[PDB]
Amino acid sequence: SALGKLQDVVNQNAQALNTLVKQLSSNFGAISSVLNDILSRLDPPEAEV
Amino acid sequence: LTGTGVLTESNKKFLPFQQFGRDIADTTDAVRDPQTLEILDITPCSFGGV
Amino acid sequence: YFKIYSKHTPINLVRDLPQGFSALEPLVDLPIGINITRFQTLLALHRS
Amino acid sequence: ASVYAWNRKRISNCVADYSVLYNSASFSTFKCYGVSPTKLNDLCFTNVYA
Ligand SMILES: *[C@@H]1O[C@H](CO)[C@@H](O)[C@H](O)[C@H]1NC(C)=O
Ligand SMILES: *[C@@H]1O[C@H](CO)[C@@H](O)[C@H](O)[C@H]1NC(C)=O
């Protein structure tokens, strides 16, 4: 634990990036979290929503 | 399953049931192709800042 | 879908379950579409 | 069948041409909810039930 101060910065940056990539898997109330699924499954009037 | 990428040979020992693979983002990173049952790795196409 | 996951393990313990880790691979993904609430296993007799 | 005993048929292991369903005028109501009607020929499905 001698170099904990640098390791905390590295861990916080990696954890923030990891959470940012994890946010892509959430649909946020939509039918799916994948854009390609929405483009392939719906007409533009519902796809825009 | 739709997407864009380069399909390459892989060394991932998939188990018989296993078909595709997923990264942290849950986007497909490897896939088993139908008809020929081979395992193709999917690597996103090169991009960066001009 | 009635999922059967299975694993075969070589064991040498006499009476109880062995203590260890063994992940069960999915064996059969079965398309039945029926209601199941009660089950019963089947044994085999030996006749002499 | 009647609506209290509605008949459920499984559809599996077939290639389905849904374009004869869209282009037929015999149906008074042809309304899809989770999928576009014109994309049904471009997608692959399982657990199809009528
Ligand atoms: C067709 O696909 C099945 C599995 O989906 C495979 O077993 C078979 O070899 C394929 N046939 C040809 C001619 O590719
Ligand atoms: C299955 O049967 C039980 C009664 O044995 C009933 O309470 C339950 O609602 C049924 N479920 C379905 C999905 O039919």
Short mmCIF file of C-alpha atoms in Angstrom, two decimals, chain C residues 1 31 33, chain D residues 10 46-47:
data_model
loop_
_atom_site.label_atom_id
_atom_site.label_comp_id
_atom_site.label_asym_id
_atom_site.label_seq_id
_atom_site.Cartn_x
_atom_site.Cartn_y
_atom_site.Cartn_z
CA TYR C 1 -38.82 -23.75 -22.45
CA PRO C 31 -39.63 -26.61 -26.39
CA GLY C 33 -44.91 -25.04 -23.63
CA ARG D 10 -45.97 -23.77 -32.04
CA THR D 46 -37.82 -18.59 -32.11
CA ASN D 47 -40.74 -19.24 -29.76
#
